[model samples]
Target chain A: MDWVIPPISLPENGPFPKNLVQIKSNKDKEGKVFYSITGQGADTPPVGVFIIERETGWLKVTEPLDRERIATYTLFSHAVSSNGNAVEDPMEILITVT
Target chain B: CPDRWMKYGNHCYYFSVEEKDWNSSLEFCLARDSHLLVITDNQEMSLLQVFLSEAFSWIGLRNNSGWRWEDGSPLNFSRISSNSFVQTCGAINKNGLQASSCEVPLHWVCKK
Candidate 1:
């Protein structure tokens, strides 16, 4: 998809063990995206503060996200095809955690 | 925690749900013979830290008079991180202490 839908915002603060966000695209192209997130997320800046399920495209939060530390987390979200091709350009979702 | 102000030790504290800037919170505390909730000890800091988990609450810590208290207390406590100098005021949260813009409107704590 050449045009990446913008304005994908996720709430940073939430009850522990709650789903924070989910990325849904063309159903036929679901496998590649993997609902991955980078930068200040699971295994990143905060280190496991945020995580994305590869197959379900579900973003889960094991703990409450804090805006105090990092007001906003810029996530580079994209879908890589099975054949090592870029399905879409990386989309930046500004996670605004209050 | 209380009907109006909560009791910690000899002092009473109140965490305002209403949000305001650093300076505004300063004046509001004076309305009740209090200053921005000053964390004089670990027990007091914990009380305020709970509020920090969700909102950035302004305390009495300032440097207008060489890193002294707004209400004229001694400088026994310090939590300012290396990156908190961007803003003249200081703020506390669950993670730790950090600096924030004085003009940035946020919730505050009051103590007397």
Candidate 2:
């Protein structure tokens, strides 16, 4: 069975480039995994903001959030193997700026 | 064409949907072989008007001894409204331009 991670919230005007959360695959029996993030604030425009540690699954926000403009962001997380194959299906991650 | 780089007149433009400080926004455009938006004339200004939504965006205008564009051009035409002249930058909302601090993060437009 797979795990469904809940959404995350980040307060606006916080110290930038902070780690918001870490993602892990419950089915990763071997304990080796590579992680990546996609969607806005990750791979789309306004990039260099939301990034992830490929091996650690730590999602980081590289800039301060502005809730007045965009209050929420949606991202997709992927876990892969050393052979560049998907170990777990893609998952949706929602981030809200409060 | 680069993603989201809109074509207008003979030049290409990129509108940032994300917010960043004025200096960082300029650097982002510069890394893409573009600079912050500079209105050369009324033609460009009204054209920009059509593209603008209800969002506040950073323009290329800033106080450097005087209001000037990043291309070393002086402010010739006038459409911006300001309250203060000290350590302020220019930004555009639905109404018009306003003087804001350079550190206030906002959306920006890039020209190439």
Candidate 3:
């Protein structure tokens, strides 16, 4: 179907600083795809990029990110059809720093 | 809140929720002081997946190169009735052992 990354937020002046992220596909009609993050200046097991599911419209953070390293992040929605065709429109999401 | 049930050894269990990303589903489990359900055999897996039909469930499985439960349990079972596919991770229903990304939105199951 389609994939979408919704908005995410980070606490202002929090601990840790920096963000690395990536996304994966979800095959379940009621399942969710995720975005994982890892890199320097991160806590063990890295961090998670926040995203939303297109089908259910649920908001979630893939993993707990260190507020210091990453104060905020932004994302958008990308869709691929059932036949593996990519959707042309880009649904951008902006996560503001709190 | 829905009724919560715990899965024990050798019993068939199944539960499903609307689609959600892996992480949100995990939070749902954690809020109840439990984690995602981990599938260790095929019998349970097949039933869970089939029951859900057109939907995916979150499991305690992750893709770390080898098939391992999130709790570090070894997946060395010898049954083809169910298969663990890599790239599927996060909260799962107790039965299917289905995997979903932590950020994708889906309902989840948990075990004690």
Candidate 4:
């Protein structure tokens, strides 16, 4: 699916676990592709702030963001084909949490 | 007035295209019976901050006595950089309020 280009302003303490953005990937071979986002940070338990659906390419933010801890988050996304082949070049997004 | 000045809340502000030094900018506003930007509250500060894009302009703030507004107000509650001696005059761009040289030429804003 086509995506929009702009800084995603996620409000702090307003909502949680909502759809953030959609990523485009190989939709021709299989029913869908797996989605994953990188660049969260070096932190506890190796976690990701954003998660995407394996088949739909929809990203979601599970936790609220505060500017004190992290004013902005730069997340890169890519898709993986069924056979473990990378779909395309990763896309970068700058998310600013207000 | 609407065509000349952009309205926000109850005040109308004019974002000028002409660039000038701080003294000249203040003079220009004084001649027009208006005052240079003395953004009072968070609402107006936020409004000006939205348009400041790293391109700064002269404001009513000065270091004449520890950064006070020309209208006799202190920098009580505002965003200001902590850098010292690099500049004393205040200007704002997308990065928010900061200090710069008094002689720096910049486009100014006035409220009437």
TM-score (all chains, Cα) for each model: 0.49, 0.50, 0.41, 0.51
lDDT for each residue of candidate 2 in B1-112, tens digit (9 for 90 to 100): 4878998667998888788878899899889998888878766877887887656688898878877877788878755554223325877755556565566567899888
Q: 2 or 3, which is superior by DockQ?
A: 3
For every prediction, compared with the true complex, DockQ reads 0.04, 0.02, 0.03, 0.01
Tell me the docking grade of candidate 1.
incorrect
Given candidate 3, what's the lDDT at residue B82? 20
lDDT of 3 by residue, B1-112 (tens): 2354635464434354465566666666677666777766776665555555333466676657765777798666532112113233643332323333346555566654
For model 2, the stretches where C-alpha displacement exceeds 4 angstroms are: A1-98, B85-87
Name the lDDT value of residue B69 in candidate 2. 79
Instruction: Give the distance in Å from residue B8's predicted Cα in candidate 3 to where it truly belongs.
Output: 7.2
lDDT at residue B86 of model 2 (Cα atoms) = 31
lDDT (tens digit, per residue) of candidate 4 on A1-98 = 43334445564463666776666654535445677677642111114567777677777776644322333456777777778777666777766545
Lowest summed lDDT window (length 10), candidate 1 chain A: A2-11
Per residue, candidate 2 scores C-alpha lDDT tens digits across A1-98 of 24323223453455666876556676566767888989888888767678989987788888766522565667778988888888877876656554
Candidate 1, position A40, lDDT: 69
Higher-ranked by TM-score: 1 or 2: 2
lDDT of 4: 0.68
Global Cα RMSD, each model: 11.9, 15.5, 17.5, 12.6
Compared with the real two-chain complex, what DockQ does model 2 have? 0.02
lDDT order, best first, reads 2, 4, 1, 3
